[PDB]
Amino acid sequence: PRKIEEIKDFLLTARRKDAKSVKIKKNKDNVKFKVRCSRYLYTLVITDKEKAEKLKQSLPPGLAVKELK
Template structure:
């Protein structure tokens, strides 16, 4: 069981910008994931090394954790990290 204060993370690798960004809105994250140059999505269960990825969606609601996986485009590579 996870600690209730530790949010889940979904990170999106894209070649749009060079600086990491934190995205708080799920709709904005999906818009970025649907762009042509989006390469992959990495799903993490903790907050370690957030700055390493270009776009990071932080989900603090436990009920909404599975929603990003279901809503991602089918051609995008999804990798779950521990």
């Protein structure tokens, strides 16, 4: 697994051709966006919730947006 640090790197990671799906896991303290690429599972950790909600609608279309809750 790989941990994506800032928001921008996650966007073009999710826009890759080998990105199979993105999973959103809502914990008590953070929201994790996990995109399943060919080699690695890229996880982006968002501390707050407004940025997590903003990222939810900005995801590329045609990609599975499975919610883990």
